[PDB]
Design a protein around this ligand. Structure first.
Ligand SMILES: NC(=O)C1=CN([C@@H]2O[C@H](COP(=O)(O)OP(=O)(O)OC[C@H]3O[C@@H](n4cnc5c(N)ncnc54)[C@H](OP(=O)(O)O)[C@@H]3O)[C@@H](O)[C@H]2O)C=CC1
Ligand code: SF4
Ligand code: SF4
Ligand SMILES: [Zn+2]
Lengths: 176, 287, 208, 144, 95, 114, 96
């Protein structure tokens, strides 16, 4: 099925040619364009006064790169290295040791926030859901030294809030 | 000695070299080329600035990822200077202003600054401290500037014995003071000998001395390879540029050789003449 | 079988089989392999001395029009006397069929430069010269597009490693952007993932 | 009815509270849309949600002065919000956090230390690893 | 549980704190070292030793699909408590 | 072993085309050092041009010499046009060391250069 | 909107497309969040008692491509396909 465009002919009737002549010599369609633009003038513009009104979102945003921990407990990661294996720019870096207990843990857990391209593959991949793409997007950093997060940075960034993260996960653990 | 201080392979761009360098000043000229050659060498450079962060923002990205570091300092106290030399392998005194201000004359920059930093450097455990000075800055006449540098040389020679006192002659480059003053004037000429030396020969000599041990305590003075007439030099500058007050006494008075003390080839770096680099650097003439 | 298995249609398989034996009948000077995959697209594997005759034939002849040109890539397979493979990828406008002319070549001997008969081939050919190094004799314009002007190495080989030999940085000593050998910040840790146990049984090559 | 809007528009000027408080939030940035008072919270900040405005101008936050001692009458930042109202304010829900405030965790800060680049306190990178190869120390006894 | 180092810098949960011959101290100049304040080792003694009377029991981790996968641990040691590898919290049996 | 070479038949056309290309480079350099506002004397540039010719001197095959003629012709065309910039011409030179010599002593102090 | 009659009349007069109806300032289909917890159904997998994986073993069914001629009067010359039918002007307001 094909519906082509631009196949008319100029009708040589007096009415059609004097309408096209009025269009030419009387600037009518240009006035029509001005009418359309003023019709959008007298509306109310959909702006938001920014630092008071933040924008809308979804409960599945990808932001801050926080870590979680067990209820009234210790860390949730294991250093199972799946997130370093699936990080598509390989920004994850994990060096792992066990501590004085015997349970396996880490030493060093690094995200390059430069090389992080915010897929969510480490959100889908982590079996204990230890790393979560955080909720907020306000990084705005002066130097290049700060943008290389450490494990203690991610723990203090997960300790800065979990109530947000827990509410969003309980909203959306059923889909993914 | 301790790890993360040993060298590693090639040089530059997070190829870690041995030195940890604390450089004074460096918002001006010679410190800026020295920071650039250290970033080409690839070491960690502590620079204190009293000035705006924007000037060191424009001379900032020559270091690699987290290599250079900033702090704040003044010429009144010792706490910020001790904070600058908390951990520093080598340290260089490159300070100075060529015109007196309200808060500081030629007195007490050259007097007040090297006393405190030489004191806290000998105390706080640094090595291979390098101090610049001007060539032929003596007790002799016609320059409060040069006699104050002679006073500073006396202090830096007396306290902290194991230094490297160094002095170049009048140096020329992309942001030179006196060569731009020659291009930006308005004018008369006498007979006055003068040797200029290009800036990268001086800074190659400085970084070779800063990485080389067992040549220390020996003061140095730098040699222009031509050493010719002032008025011929003004003629050559106006020729390549196509056009027909303490500073003016300093440039008119004297610039001589001193055969007492070693120079370039006793350290092993090739000198470059004025004419080649002057064709290279004299832009900004008409059209 | 019936759910979640992409079903094949043997009609296109049989018609392209007949068309392939037809082509091998009518151009016996250059034909080596005529192979048909399970998803029914034709693959004609050709010596590189009949590129101009095969394309001048396959543009016309009214049993297969094939006006349209696409991808040309000379996919570098080593362990061969001829490394590179020119892949012409031709499309009809009347017939809705896709044929892949895979002609072989090496690093040095030129193919016959199809730009005289397919006008689309000009920048495709310039791209294959700038990335691989297959020279094109009797071709008007060979320059560099997609690489820097001071650059050499033909980077899409396998013999060009993933990082570069040159890397730019600005320096104020000469007030310009200069090229230095590479000094990375991280290793690009490459993970061995060629896992054993032969994940496909039908593609077992004959051993010795 | 053009004079009725100027009469209706003058009421929300006084609905904020007056003139000097009105001039405060007016010269702060813009807002004159006062009238509901959904939520107040620690560090003094207030939260308003109207239903006559559209999606994006539903909910807004008004910050107080010196919430962390930083003279924030002017120069209001992002992330001067506590995180439960950060869930409320992006329209991630339809309930204020007076419906489900808490969590079952004894580690959350009382502060919510705000964005801190360019400050006396900013983050630094450092390796979270002990000694690499354990360089050998020679013994302290002398010989010859 | 920070350690009174001669440097005075805060130690971490991993023994990585510096020496007097480290210039990474002088890159911590004026920039306060953010260390974790709530550790991970001592938060096990804060949790009581649970007592479940059966022999071989099942651990999930506080709710379905939020936590670690099902791990079926054994309690056959007469003097050593059980320990889930994922959780970290112990179990004992009641005869 | 059936090989069809590019342009030549033996090394006689190779020598002919490479001496023509060297003549082109010899008369094309002073135009560029006028145009790009460089920092280099003319004879230094000519000496590094003949250095770049001397670098590839140990090549025997006719196809490789013809392909080098093609490469040099392409870059001479892109330098007589103004399509390249000052970065590229300085990239042909070396005024940013790279200082490491071929001494075994210096390759002993600087680590791991066999 | 939410305003007087004269300016709404000038808005309708400057473009007669009933501006108050569809105005791009939405107030009503802000979606009512905290939805009931959705159950995601699963179709023709996880059914017990017949799901031999060898039956629906779709990865293994990829045959190597069948080879016709190499280097190692028949009434013929068919095309690769039938000629594709010429289309038609659609009914949904064509031109002309
Ligand atoms: N021919 C030459 O140019 C010669 C130069 N030198 C030395 O070379 C260096 C650079 O040369 P030049 O450009 O002329 O000097 P500069 O003024 O450019 O370099 C000195 C730097 O230290 C800063 N500084 C100096 N005194 C003070 C002070 N009291 N308090 C705070 N900051 C101070 C300067 O200004 P700011 O504070 O704004 O950063 C500048 O950043 C100087 O140390 C000079 O003595 C010596 C002999 C010859
Ligand atoms: S995938 Fe999860 S559990 Fe595994 S190493 Fe990464 S954060 Fe830890
Ligand atoms: S979201 Fe970031 S850290 Fe996670 S896998 Fe992607 S790039 Fe890596
Ligand atoms: Zn468990």
């Amino acid at each position: 099925t094909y519906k082509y465009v631009n196949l008319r002919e100029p009708s040589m009737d007096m009415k059609s040619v004097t309408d096209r002549a009025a269009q030419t010599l009387l600037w009518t369609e240009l006035i029509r364009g001005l009418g359309m633009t003023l019709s959008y003038l007298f509306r109310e513009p959909a702006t938001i006064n920014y630092p008071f009104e933040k924008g809308p979102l979804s409960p599945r945003f990808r932001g801050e790169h926080a870590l979680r921990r067990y209820p009234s407990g210790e860390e949730r990661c294991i250093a199972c290295k799946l997130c370093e294996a699936v990080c598509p720019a390989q920004a994850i870096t994990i060096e792992a040791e066990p501590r004085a207990d015997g349970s396996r843990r880490t030493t060093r857990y690094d995200i390059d926030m430069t090389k992080c391209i915010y897929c969510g593959f480490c959100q889908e991949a982590c079996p204990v859901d230890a790393i979560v793409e955080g909720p907020n997007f306000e990084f705005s950093t002066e130097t290049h030294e700060e943008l290389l997060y450490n494990k203690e940075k991610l723990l203090n960034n997960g300790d800065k809030w979990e109530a947000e993260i827990a509410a969003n996960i309980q909203a959306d653990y059923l889909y993914r | 000695l301790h790890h993360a201080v040993i060298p590693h392979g090639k040089g530059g761009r997070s190829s870690v070299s041995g030195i940890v360098a604390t450089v004074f000043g460096a918002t001006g000229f010679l410190g800026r080329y020295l920071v650039n050659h250290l970033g080409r060498m690839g070491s960690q450079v502590i620079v204190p600035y009293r000035c705006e962060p924007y000037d060191t923002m424009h001379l900032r990205p020559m270091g690699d990822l987290g290599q250079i570091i900033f702090m704040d300092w003044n010429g009144r106290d010792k706490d910020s200077i001790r904070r600058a030399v908390e951990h520093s392998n080598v340290v260089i005194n490159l300070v100075g202003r060529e015109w007196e201000t309200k808060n500081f004359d030629f007195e007490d920059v050259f007097v007040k600054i090297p006393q405190a930093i030489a004191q806290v450097s000998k105390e706080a455990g640094v090595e291979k401290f390098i101090h610049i000075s001007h060539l032929n800055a003596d007790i002799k006449s016609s320059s409060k500037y040069l006699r104050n540098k002679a006073v500073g040389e006396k202090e830096v020679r007396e306290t902290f014995p194991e230094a490297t006192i160094i002095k170049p002659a009048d140096i020329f480059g992309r942001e030179d003071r006196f060569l731009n003053y020659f291009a930006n004037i308005r004018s008369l000429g006498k007979k006055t000998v003068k040797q200029p030396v290009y800036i990268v020969d001086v800074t190659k000599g400085i970084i070779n001395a800063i990485k080389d041990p067992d040549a220390r305590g020996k003061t140095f003075a730098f040699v222009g390879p031509n050493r010719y007439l002032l008025f011929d030099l003004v003629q050559y500058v106006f020729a390549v540029a196509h056009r027909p007050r303490d500073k003016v006494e300093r440039i008119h008075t004297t610039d001589r050789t001193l055969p007492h003390l070693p120079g370039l080839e006793d350290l092993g770096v090739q000198a470059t003449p004025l004419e080649l680099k002057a064709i290279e650097v004299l832009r900004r003439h008409r059209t | 079988t019936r759910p979640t298995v992409r079903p094949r249609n043997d009609v296109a398989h049989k018609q392209l089989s007949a068309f392939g034996e037809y082509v091998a009948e009518i151009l016996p000077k250059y034909v080596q392999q005529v192979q048909v995959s399970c998803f029914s697209e034709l693959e004609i594997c050709i010596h590189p001395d009949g590129v101009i005759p095969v394309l001048t034939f396959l543009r016309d002849h009214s049993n297969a029009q094939f006006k349209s040109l696409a991808d040309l890539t000379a996919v570098d397979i080593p362990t061969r006397q001829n490394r590179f493979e020119i892949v012409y990828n031709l499309l009809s406008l009347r017939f809705n069929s896709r044929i892949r002319v895979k002609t072989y070549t090496d690093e040095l001997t030129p193919v016959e430069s199809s730009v005289s008969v397919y006008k689309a081939a000009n920048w495709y050919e310039r791209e294959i010269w700038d990335m691989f190094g297959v020279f094109f004799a009797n071709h008007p314009d060979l320059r560099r597009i997609l690489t820097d002007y001071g650059f050499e190495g033909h980077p899409f080989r396998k013999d060009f490693p993933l990082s570069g030999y040159v890397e730019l940085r600005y320096d104020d000593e000469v007030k310009r952007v200069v090229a230095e050998p590479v000094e990375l910040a991280q290793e690009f840790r490459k993970f061995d993932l060629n896992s054993p146990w032969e994940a496909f049984p039908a593609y077992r090559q004959p051993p010795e | 009815e053009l004079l009725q809007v100027l009469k209706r528009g003058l009421q929300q000027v006084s609905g904020h509270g007056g003139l000097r408080g009105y001039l405060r939030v007016l010269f702060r940035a813009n807002d004159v849309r006062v009238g509901t008072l959904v939520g107040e919270d620690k560090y003094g900040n207030k939260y308003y949600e109207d239903n006559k405005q559209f999606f994006g101008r539903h909910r807004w936050v008004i910050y107080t002065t010196e919430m962390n001692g930083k003279n924030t009458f002017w120069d209001v930042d992002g992330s001067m919000v506590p995180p439960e109202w950060h869930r409320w304010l992006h329209c991630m829900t339809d309930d204020p956090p007076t419906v489900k405030p808490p969590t079952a965790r004894k580690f959350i800060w009382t502060n919510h230390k705000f964005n801190l680049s360019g400050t006396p306190q900013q983050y630094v990178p450092y390796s979270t690893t002990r000694k690499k190869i354990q360089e050998w120390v020679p013994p302290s006894t002398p010989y010859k | 549980g920070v350690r009174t180092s001669p440097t005075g810098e805060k130690v971490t949960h991993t023994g990585q704190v510096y020496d007097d011959e480290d210039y990474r101290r002088v890159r911590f100049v004026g920039r306060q070292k953010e260390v974790n304040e709530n550790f991970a080792i001592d938060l096990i003694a804060e949790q009581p030793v649970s007592q479940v009377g059966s022999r071989v029991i099942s651990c999930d981790g506080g709710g379905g699909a939020l936590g670690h996968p099902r791990v079926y641990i054994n309690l056959d040691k007469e003097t050593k408590t059980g320990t889930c590898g994922y959780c970290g919290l112990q179990f004992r049996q009641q005869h | 072993t059936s090989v069809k070479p590019i342009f030549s038949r033996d090394m006689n056309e190779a020598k002919r085309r490479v001496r023509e290309l060297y003549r082109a480079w010899y008369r094309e350099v002073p135009n560029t050092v006028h145009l790009f506002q460089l920092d280099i004397s003319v004879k230094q540039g000519r000496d590094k041009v003949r250095e770049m010719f001397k670098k590839n001197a140990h090549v025997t095959d006719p196809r490789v010499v013809d392909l080098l003629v093609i490469k040099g012709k392409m870059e001479l065309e892109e330098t007589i046009n103004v399509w390249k910039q000052r970065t590229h011409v300085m990239r042909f030179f070396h005024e940013t060391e790279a200082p490491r010599p071929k001494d075994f002593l210096s390759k002993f102090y600087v680590g791991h250069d066999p | 909107a939410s305003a007087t009659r004269l300016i709404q009349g000038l808005r309708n007069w400057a473009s007669g497309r009933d501006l108050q109806a569809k105005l791009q300032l939405r107030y009503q289909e802000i979606s009512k969040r905290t939805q009931p917890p959705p159950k995601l159904p699963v179709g023709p997998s996880h059914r017990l008692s017949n799901n031999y994986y060898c039956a629906r073993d779709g990865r293994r069914e990829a045959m190597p491509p069948s080879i016709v001629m190499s280097s190692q009067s028949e009434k013929k010359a068919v095309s690769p396909a039938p000629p594709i039918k010429r289309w038609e002007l659609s009914q949904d307001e064509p031109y002309l």
